[PDB]
């Protein structure tokens, strides 16, 4: 029974890896030869937003490319403006130990997930103007790692226990339990068409899922340690994942295999947050060492550094229109680079 | 100028928000955050009840000092993955059940847990207020059976004072560094009201440490 099923599972794994090797005819490094490199890229600190007073864990640009949402070690979730560095809203949340920042595409809701296995949805544009608790999503057994927004009605939440979830906003109950994983879950970034999203494993398993069906489609491996952050390519066909192995690894959804690794001998510190830029040419990835790095998705050759913080870059995000990128580290300051 | 009138009203709102943030941070820094931990089936609920989902935060003030107490032991996940979020706690209230010595074994599991926690890179300078529970039951069990079963290197006999001293020194020696931090131990039982007094004293000692560090008088 158990022996037969495990051995046929091993045979299936050998078959799938052999078939992947059959598909891998020429690597991306060989594919992109005689192409003009982007050259050295230097971006200065346009703004330093100093509202916060403690560690910054997450940050998410808005669809308008105008507002910033920044969690913090303290119970503050102060929402920022970019051009005029004001504090549009200051949210005094209750579960101070937060690690998520979700901004609704319509700009009406902002969500945060504390360490207490609770994802809290916050209303922004309401009568009697002040931020109010829209809903307190509960049902998980582990801490919420990252949260996104399908729309104002649905939210996808990664959790400490090995299960993601697609929630319902009106009724607190979750409609689909995404427990087809093993280990822990860290990152998730949806496609531009909001159809498929991936999962950031704690055991090097980037799992693509289907929002409507409710099961995996393509299981990915290739790292030797936990993978921390994931961000989709702007087409929504590929994504690169940043593990604790100091390696950025770029996948695809039509070969289910690696395209190229981003590992430098100098860097031993892992990736905390990764976020692509528009056209996906650049690959912005935060780092545990007090520095952030700029890569190229087609050629592993490294672009200019993005440094200036005093603590590890715990979050990173690029504007939807792509004008600029903001960096949030454990120093209270958040730097926006253009 | 060259700012709109509503833009100036918005910068006034931003200044008000910053002022509220400053007030909140000033009233939060003076608060003391004590990270509670422990081993499996520890008396964390008991020690919480003696004073006054995931985390169960505890609010209570003693001698004009609002304390933060966080029974994180009920999480059931990978510690080294979120324990970085707890950097900067004033102290780590450790919980070790004395009487569970004969019970892989609970004492050595807790010793490995303590070694990791005290030697974690995030808690390089945060003092640990170690607690030992059920002294009377531990004494009864030591009188019943010798402690040598748990400790193959034990050299003493079956007496309360020597057994307590042995386990205390064994736990204290576990620190790789002892100059940056300190380990405060209190043998506590069910009928020990002085626990809040010892917690207060240890918090005063550690906060004297922190203030002297901050002032640069070091």
């Amino acid at each position: 029974e158990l022996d037969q099923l495990r051995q046929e599972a091993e045979q299936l794994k050998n078959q799938i890896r052999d078939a992947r090797k059959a598909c891998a005819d020429a690597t991306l490094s060989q594919i992109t030869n005689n192409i003009d490199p982007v050259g050295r890229i230097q971006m200065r600190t346009r703004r330093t937003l100093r509202g916060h007073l403690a560690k910054i864990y997450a940050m998410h640009w808005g669809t308008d490319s105008r507002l910033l949402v920044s969690a913090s070690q303290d119970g503050k979730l102060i929402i920022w403006d970019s051009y005029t560095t004001n504090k549009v809203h200051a949210i005094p949340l209750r579960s101070s130990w937060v690690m998520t920042c979700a901004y609704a595409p319509s700009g009406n809701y902002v969500a945060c997930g504390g360490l207490d296995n609770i994802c809290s949805i916050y209303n922004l544009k309401t009568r009697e103007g002040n931020v109010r608790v829209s809903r307190e999503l509960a049902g998980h057994t582990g801490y919420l790692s990252c949260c996104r927004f399908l729309d104002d009605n649905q939210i996808v939440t990664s959790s400490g226990d090995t299960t993601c979830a697609l929630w319902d906003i009106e009724t607190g109950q979750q409609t689909t339990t995404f427990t087809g994983h093993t280990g822990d879950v860290m990152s998730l970034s949806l496609a531009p068409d909001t159809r498929l999203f991936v999962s950031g494993a704690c055991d090097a398993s980037a799992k693509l899922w289907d929002v409507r069906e409710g099961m995996c489609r393509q299981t990915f491996t290739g790292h030797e340690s936990d993978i921390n952050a994931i961000c989709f390519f702007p087409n929504g066909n590929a994504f690169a994942t940043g593990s604790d192995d100091a390696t950025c690894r770029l996948f695809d959804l039509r070969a289910d295999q690696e395209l190229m690794t981003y590992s430098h001998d100098n860097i031993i510190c892992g990736i905390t947050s990764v976020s692509f830029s528009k056209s996906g040419r650049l690959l912005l990835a935060g780092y545990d060492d007090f520095n952030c790095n700029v890569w190229d998705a087609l050629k592993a050759d490294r672009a200019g550094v993005l440094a200036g913080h005093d603590n590890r870059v715990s979050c990173l995000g690029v504007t939807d229109d792509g004008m600029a990128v903001a960096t949030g580290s454990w120093d209270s300051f958040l730097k926006i680079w253009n | 100028c060259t700012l709109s009138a509503e833009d100036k009203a918005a910068v006034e709102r931003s200044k008000m928000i910053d002022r509220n943030l400053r007030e909140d941070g000033e009233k939060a820094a003076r608060e003391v955050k004590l990270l509670l931990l422990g081993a499996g089936e520890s008396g964390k609920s008991t020690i919480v009840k003696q004073m006054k989902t995931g985390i169960v935060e505890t609010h209570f003030t003693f001698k004009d000092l609002h304390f933060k107490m966080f029974d994180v032991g009920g999480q059931r996940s990978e510690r080294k993955k979120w324990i970085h979020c707890f950097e900067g706690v004033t102290a780590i209230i450790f919980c070790v059940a004395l009487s569970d010595y004969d019970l892989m074994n609970r004492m050595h599991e807790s010793m490995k847990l303590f070694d990791s926690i005290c030697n974690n890179k995030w808690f390089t300078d945060t003092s640990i207020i170690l607690f030992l529970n059920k002294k009377d039951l531990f004494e009864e069990k030591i009188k019943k059976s010798p402690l040598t079963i748990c400790y193959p290197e034990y050299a003493g006999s079956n007496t309360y004072e020597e057994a307590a001293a042995y386990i205390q020194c064994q736990f204290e020696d576990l620190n790789k560094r002892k100059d940056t931090k300190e380990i405060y131990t209190h043998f506590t039982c069910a009928t020990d009201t002085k626990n809040v007094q010892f917690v207060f004293d240890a918090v005063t000692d550690v906060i004297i440490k922190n203030n002297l560090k901050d002032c640069g008088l070091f």
């Epitope: 507002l67 103007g129 | 006034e12």
Partner: single-chain antibody
């Protein structure tokens, strides 16, 4: 989110009276309140300004010095003390609440207010027509022209469109040109460039008839245009 005001009445000229408004059901402290007064047969004009935390206080040129306005956040009431009463002062005062931030809708709710009666360098808002005849179900366009360009460097115009009903307090329509407010149907729309502005109403319901209003917010006299009635 009701706003109710108290005080006022028949006062001998030159007297002193207290005009206070009560706020309930909404966060008073964050909001910056306003006072706008209307004569029985005249259009509205701005009077006073207060900010969150009482940091910033502004008055109209005519009412400068004579009035004093102070908000009490714990009391949840804003009160205005009234001095040197004249024939230009007799009117009905409107309680206005506004919040200023990116994407905000300032001047969105207006209280019922109370009436005060007595014995008896500013940019101009002009309206081409008043009491314009209109047919239900058609499209009507009303022009409000500003002497000063309202586009500013930020690229956003600052004309606010307000709608008044017979016997009803005004409500916000266009919190910034081509931006529609909450609780307002999609028929109303706004468009304009430079200084020449207009408000386009795709279809007219029986309820949405009355005097329309336009103002500015670049600078602080907060001028209003002479209202335009809509005639069936």
């Amino acid at each position: 989110v009701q706003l109710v005001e108290s005080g006022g009445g028949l006062v001998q000229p030159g007297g002193s009276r207290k005009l206070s408004c009560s706020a309930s059901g909404f966060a008073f402290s964050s909001f910056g309140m306003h006072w706008v007064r209307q004569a029985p047969e005249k259009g509205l004009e701005w009077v006073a300004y207060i900010s969150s935390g009482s940091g910033t206080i502004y008055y109209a040129d005519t009412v400068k010095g004579r009035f004093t306005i102070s908000r009490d956040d714990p009391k949840n009431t804003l009160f205005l003390q009234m001095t040197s009463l004249r024939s230009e002062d007799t009117a009905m005062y409107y309680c206005v609440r506004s919040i200023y931030y990116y994407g905000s809708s300032p001047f969105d709710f207006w209280g019922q207010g109370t009436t005060l009666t007595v014995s008896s360098s500013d940019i101009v808002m002009t309206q081409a027509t008043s009491s314009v005849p209109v047919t239900p179900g058609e499209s009507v366009s009303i022009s409000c022209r500003s002497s000063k360009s309202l586009l500013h460097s930020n690229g956003n115009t600052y004309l606010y469109w307000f709608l008044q009903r017979p016997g009803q307090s005004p409500q916000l329509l266009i919190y910034r040109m081509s931006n529609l407010a909450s609780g307002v149907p999609d028929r109303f729309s706004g468009s304009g460039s430079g200084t020449a502005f207009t408000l386009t109403i795709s279809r007219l319901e029986a309820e949405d008839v009355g005097v329309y209003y336009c103002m500015q917010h670049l600078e602080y006299p907060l001028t209003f245009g002479a209202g335009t009635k809509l005639e069936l």
